Structure formats: C-alpha cells, structure tokens
Amino acid sequence: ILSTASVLAFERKLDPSDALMSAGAWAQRDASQEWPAVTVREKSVRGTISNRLKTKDRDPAKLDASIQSPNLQTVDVANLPSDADTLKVRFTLRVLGGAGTPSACNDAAYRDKLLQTVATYVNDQGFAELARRYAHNLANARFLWRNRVGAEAVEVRINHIRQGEVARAWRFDALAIGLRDFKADAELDALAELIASGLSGSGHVLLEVVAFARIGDGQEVFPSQELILDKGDKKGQKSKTLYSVRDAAAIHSQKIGNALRTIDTWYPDEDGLGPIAVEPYGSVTSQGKAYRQPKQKLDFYTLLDNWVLRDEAPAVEQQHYVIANLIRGGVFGE
Amino acid sequence: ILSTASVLAFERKLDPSDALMSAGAWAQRDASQEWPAVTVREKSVRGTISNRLKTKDRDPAKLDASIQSPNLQTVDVANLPSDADTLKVRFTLRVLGGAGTPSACNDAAYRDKLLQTVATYVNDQGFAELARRYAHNLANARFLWRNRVGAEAVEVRINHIRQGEVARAWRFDALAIGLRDFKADAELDALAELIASGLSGSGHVLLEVVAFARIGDGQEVFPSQELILDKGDKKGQKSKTLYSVRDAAAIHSQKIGNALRTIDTWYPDEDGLGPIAVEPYGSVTSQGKAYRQPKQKLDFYTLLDNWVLRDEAPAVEQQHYVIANLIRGGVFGEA
Amino acid sequence: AQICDEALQYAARLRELEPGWSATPGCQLHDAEQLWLDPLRAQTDETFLQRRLRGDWPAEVGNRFANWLNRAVSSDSQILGSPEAAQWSQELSKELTMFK
C-alpha cells in the first residue's frame, strides 16, 4: 500500500526580504534613492493603571488603589521627520519555481506519486490563478500592515530586475485595488504572467518592490515589533521592541510573506470577508478563528492525502489551496 | 584462500575545508578580499500551528484551541545586506594521491593483492574519468546547495596555489555547466588533468575555490544547519542552529565533500535522473532510496570482493565506482 | 545599596534550595521573612496561600531588616533611631515590591 512519507520538507517559494523603511516628501518619489531611513527611538511614557485589576486575594481598596498613582513605561517608537509625509518601504522578492518537488522525502514511491500529481496539476492548468492573486497582493500594498489604514495615497512600484538593470517596471495605485476582491487589469495580468513564468520554472524572476504612502507630517510608522517574552518577576521591563536593520526601522520578512501569501478566498464560511493566509488548518491567530478545521474535510492535510494517495482529486479551488500551501512550504509527515 | 582483511582503513582523498560565506556586490568580484562576512542572527518568530496533530489520545478542545492560538519559535537566519546582491563562498581543497594504499590492514597478502588490483586499474587507465567528473562537480557550483536554486548567475573561480600564490586560474559560468550532463571544455579537462596528476601522486595540488552567486538585495542565504544531538532535542527551545566558524556563516566541510562526490552516474536503476554521491550501498537519505542495494550484485562490497579475492573484474564503470569509493575512503573489513 | 543587594542575592541563592518548605520550627522571626524567600509559584498549584500577595511581607521585611541594621550598626554615636529605620525599611521595601 502507498502511505505518506514520514519526512516531507517543502522549500519556500516566493522568498521575500526584510522590508526597510525610509521617509521623504511626496512627488519626490522618483529620486527616492537617498531618502533618510526611519530610526527607532526609545521614549519613556507616564500613564494610568489601565487594565482589569486582579481582585482575588489582594486588599479590597487599599493595595488595589494603585490607581491615583501613575505607572512609568519605556517603549519604542518610529516616527517620520517633521518635514516628511511619505513612508517608503522597499524589499526584494525571488520567485523560484519547482513547487511540488520536496527537498526531502523518505518514501520514494510517495515522492513519485506526488510529483506526478503536481505535474498533472501544472499541465492541465497553469500557474494562472495563484500568480494572479499573488500579483494582486503585490499590487495593493498589504505588506504595509498598519501603515495602510490611514493613508490617502499608496503607490507601489515593482521592477523586474534582469541583470543589474530593470526590464519591466509596473506602477500601481494600491488604493484603487481593494484588499478583498481580485479584479482584472491590463498591467496586472502581465505581472501575473511573469510570476507564473517564475513559478513554473520558465525563467528566473527577481522583483524589487517599493511602496510609498502619504500618512502625514511627523506621524507614527509601525514597523515589526520584536518578539520578546517578558517575565512576571523583576518587573519594570521594556515591553515594546521594534525590529531594526542597522539603524533603520523595518518589517520582518515573514510579515511580508504573510501579506503576500493571503490569497485564500475558499473556506466554507465566507460570504465576502476577504482572503486569508494559506496555512495548513488555515487560521488567523490575531482574529482568533481557525478556518478549515479538521472537522470539515477542507484541511490541507485531508485534501492532500485524498489527492495524492486515494486519487480523489478535489475541486479546482481546493487544488489552488493545496498548491498554494506547497508554494509556501513546510514540514509534513507521520 | 585469501579472505579479506579484518580491518581496512582508507584515508580521505579530496580533502575540503569549511566554506566561509561573505557578501558583496556583483561586477566588483575581483576585489572580493575584504568583503564583510555574512553573520548568523537569531530571531524569534510567531507562526500558526501547522503540523499533523496527534489526535490519537488528546481531547478535541485542546487541539482546536491549539490551532487557533499561535506558537512562538526561535530560529537562526543569515541574510545578505540591503546593498549586497552577491554571496561569495570560499573554501580550499587538497588532493592527495596514493588512493589505493590503505592505512590499516590485518592480512598482508590481502594488502599486496589489493595494491596489485589498484595498480592494474591505474596502468590500464589513469584517473581521467574520475578527475573529469570531480572537475565537473567543482566547475558547476554544486557545493552551493540551496544557495544555487534561485541564483541569477553563478561564477566559480578556481586557483591553483603553487607556493602561497596562484599559478593557474580557471573561471567558470556555473549555470551553463549543468548538474547532470558531463560535457567537455578546454578549461574543464585542463582542470581534470590537474586533479588527475594530483590523484596519481605526480604533484602537490591545492586549490582555492571561490564561488559568487547573484541572489539579490537582502535575500536569505543558507549555511549548514548544525546537528544538535542529545543536548537540545528535549523541549524545542531552539529550533534551528546554523553553523558559524568565527562570526561568519559557513558551510560544513563534509557537505562540500558530499557535493564533490556526486559523480556516480552508474547504478542498476535509471541513470537519467542524474548523478548521486559515491557511497557503499549508494544512498540518498534525503531522497529516501538506496541505489546499489546488496540484492542486485552492484554495491561496493560485492564488486570489491569479486575484484580482489576471486579476481573477476567487473564492468569498467563499476570499477570506476569502486575506485571512487577508495578515493572517498572509509572503514571496510569483515569480522 | 551593597547591603540590600546582598540581601537580594541571599534571597535569590536560597531560591535554589526547594520550592516547598513547611512549618519547620523557629517561627519567632520567621513569618514576615517567611514569604520574602519566595515559594517558587510551582509547589502552590491551587493557591493554598492567601497572604502571598496581600502585601504583608515587604514593609515588615524592610522594618525588621532595618531593625537588624539598627542593632548591628551602632558606633560611638550610640543611638541610630527610628526615622533611619523607616528610611532603610522603605528602601528595601521599594526594592522588594520592584519584583512585580
């Protein structure tokens, strides 16, 4: 009998970089090669005790009167200069190709069957529905996470770097293209064709993405906050640390990958909520939900194990979901 | 009766070094002597629970609460700088010579018979095919394992260090030279003649191999992940440790040695897939298959016991394979 | 400062003994400083102790520490006094409530 392999290692296609941030004035976006980078400052604030107080075994009103007395915190903040109203976010993106070919597989018969199934998918249908949604998520600047909610003009410039030059430069208005529906455009299907050629393996694809946003003069930008687990003893810590490449505020590359990866509009309880990041057991931990629970038979693992082993080929949307999870990569097994 | 020796120790030929990684820009690769080294850095990331859940004895409420809530993991990463689009990886290689002489034996008559067999192989045909395939594995940048699959253009320079400086420098386009086709070029068989003269013992050959790969601005490069055995496989408190020599990301020397040894185009299955690494019971544990199993009589031990004891010579490609195994070196010998 | 951080080091290096102590004898001085040497928050496991977070320990530990430093440091300037006791008491009390 053919069973799934115990070691399965799928490499990451659509490799992003750390997206570095700088600041400048709008309409000077063309000469934005020398804009000063946004630096992370550390500031100390004094505030009130603003949390639900524990009232289990403390004093009723004596030691629980930590109110009427401030608390003193020391956090980080990234700001624009006072004479700059435009955040510029720049990163690179490689599109590798060879999606369903794992870098490690124990069962070789399973590897041959999986490669046959993936090549069957790519030869009956191109990489035309995945790369279109990837080019859409590149088009609207969803990689600006909280830097997109209050902007009046978001413009994305995408260069296809050929040797050391540019070979094709796209320029999209990221606010006309919504974050929830995938329309068609004369400049967007060309980028979808280029990402499809990179995904199938027809050519080496390297893109430089740079997005400008008008937020305002001297306002606050939100780079990636670092993950530091603070402890309950010896309190009075920092409790906010923003990530930085060398004296420059930046976004984590996995955050850019998550905002480029959110193409899943096929989950059984959607009526127009919008795309979700393609995950096995596709879940938003910030929103608290977990769509495609294994109670329903729409998990990545059940769909893959029914497609490859039992040859129960799913619907075309679920095929797009499974191949998007293979493009993301990961560790599968026993 | 001439049974095989009880101990057999063959020292490693083609001894590589730990390949250091640094970063810089393309079209200034000639002044790549002061390029800043790629440094490994730890990062804590937040992901979702994405693995096959053990739903055998656990309650469903804890399982879907686990897939709802995130999980936080600390891994290492080595990236290029934002102005650097080229990874420069440098190692040194010695080829030794005297591939047939073992370093340990128990039966001296077996030692003389094995040396006679290797000498008949050598004066029948030199180390031309093996050094041709080794020079091919040096020319195309197979030692960049995951640093090659998305590179736009790879250039591999190979210097022959005569005293402390170069005496012959080759420069190859590592993407035009494929990973499976063994072609013929003038610089390629010149380097093959050098490696053959080093393997025959007719000269001291030390090479410096420096490979530049154009990956892109600020992209992730991949050194060797360290095997942490019985010190950190308990909690999962550190999921991915990378290998660094001295404040510099580096590739393991035995990984470069496995990359150069990927010349075995001969095995009883279909040879159209490309070469595999030369090992007895030729095994790709990442691909999970063992070519040259002991069932089909084409493993290294069966061919060696047929060649030396019973004096039946195998096919010429199979004796190419077993002499490549003797170049690899190892521990052989029955009880 | 060196004396109170030595007391903090004594509280930290005696956190390496065991989580769970008991009503082992000698409780004539051992009710306020009983809980300054923390119960490691792992032997508890169901909140069997109600005065662990009541606030009873830090002012009393600072008071009895400053009384120890009063009776220990008394030069030819013989009396040291109660306001100095309250000052060193509130000093150690701030550095003990700094833990949470």
Curated annotation (Swiss-Prot), chain A:
Q: What is this protein called?
A: CRISPR-associated protein Csy3
Task: Please give the knockout or disruption phenotype noted for this protein.
Answer: Mutants lose phage DMS3 infection-dependent inhibition of biofilm formation while there is normal biofilm formation in the absence of phage infection. Decreased production of crRNA in the presence or absence of phage. Disruption of the entire Y.pestis-subtype CRISPR region disrupts crRNA production but does not alter phage resistance (possibly OLNs PA14_33350 to PA14_33310, and the flanking CRISPR loci), indicating this CRISPR is not involved in phage resistance.
The entry sums up its family as follows: Belongs to the CRISPR-associated Csy3 family.
Kindly give the NCBIfam families that the UniProt entry links to this protein.
cas_Csy3
The intrachain disulfides are: none
Q: Membrane-crossing residues? A: none
Q: What does the record note on quaternary structure? A: Part of the Csy ribonucleoprotein complex with a probable stoichiometry of Csy1(1),Csy2(1),Csy3(6),Cas6/Csy4(1)-crRNA(1). A Csy3(6),Cas6/Csy4(1)-crRNA(1) subcomplex is also formed.
Which InterPro entries does the protein's record reference? CRISPR-assoc_prot_Csy3 (IPR013399)
Give the superkingdom in one word: Bacteria
What the protein does comes down to: CRISPR (clustered regularly interspaced short palindromic repeat) is an adaptive immune system that provides protection against mobile genetic elements (viruses, transposable elements and conjugative plasmids). CRISPR clusters contain sequences complementary to antecedent mobile elements and target invading nucleic acids. CRISPR clusters are transcribed and processed into CRISPR RNA (crRNA). Cas3 and Cascade participate in CRISPR interference, the third stage of CRISPR immunity (Potential). Involved in crRNA production or stability.
The processes (GO biological process) annotated in the record are: defense response to virus
Alphabetized, the UniProt keywords read: Antiviral defense
Additional observations:
In this bacteria, Y.pestis-subtype CRISPRs do not confer resistance to phage DMS3 or MP22, but instead are required for DMS3 infection-dependent inhibition of biofilm formation and possibly motility.
From Swiss-Prot, chain C:
| Superkingdom field | Bacteria
Q: Which cysteines are joined by disulfide bonds?
A: none
Effect of knocking it out?
Mutants lose phage DMS3 infection-dependent inhibition of biofilm formation while there is normal biofilm formation in the absence of phage infection. Decreased production of crRNA in the presence or absence of phage. Disruption of the entire Y.pestis-subtype CRISPR region disrupts crRNA production but does not alter phage resistance (possibly OLNs PA14_33350 to PA14_33310, and the flanking CRISPR loci), indicating this CRISPR is not involved in phage resistance.
Q: Which family does it belong to?
A: Belongs to the CRISPR-associated Csy1 family.
Q: How does it assemble?
A: Interacts directly with Csy2; part of the Csy ribonucleoprotein complex with a probable stoichiometry of Csy1(1),Csy2(1),Csy3(6),Cas6/Csy4(1)-crRNA(1). A Csy3(6),Cas6/Csy4(1)-crRNA(1) subcomplex is also formed.
Additional remarks: In this bacteria, Y.pestis-subtype CRISPRs do not confer resistance to phage DMS3 or MP22, but instead are required for DMS3 infection-dependent inhibition of biofilm formation and possibly motility.
Record function comment:
CRISPR (clustered regularly interspaced short palindromic repeat) is an adaptive immune system that provides protection against mobile genetic elements (viruses, transposable elements and conjugative plasmids). CRISPR clusters contain sequences complementary to antecedent mobile elements and target invading nucleic acids. CRISPR clusters are transcribed and processed into CRISPR RNA (crRNA). Cas3 and Cascade participate in CRISPR interference, the third stage of CRISPR immunity (Potential). Involved in crRNA production or stability.
Designated name of the protein = CRISPR-associated protein Csy1
Which organism does this record belong to?
Pseudomonas aeruginosa (strain UCBPP-PA14)
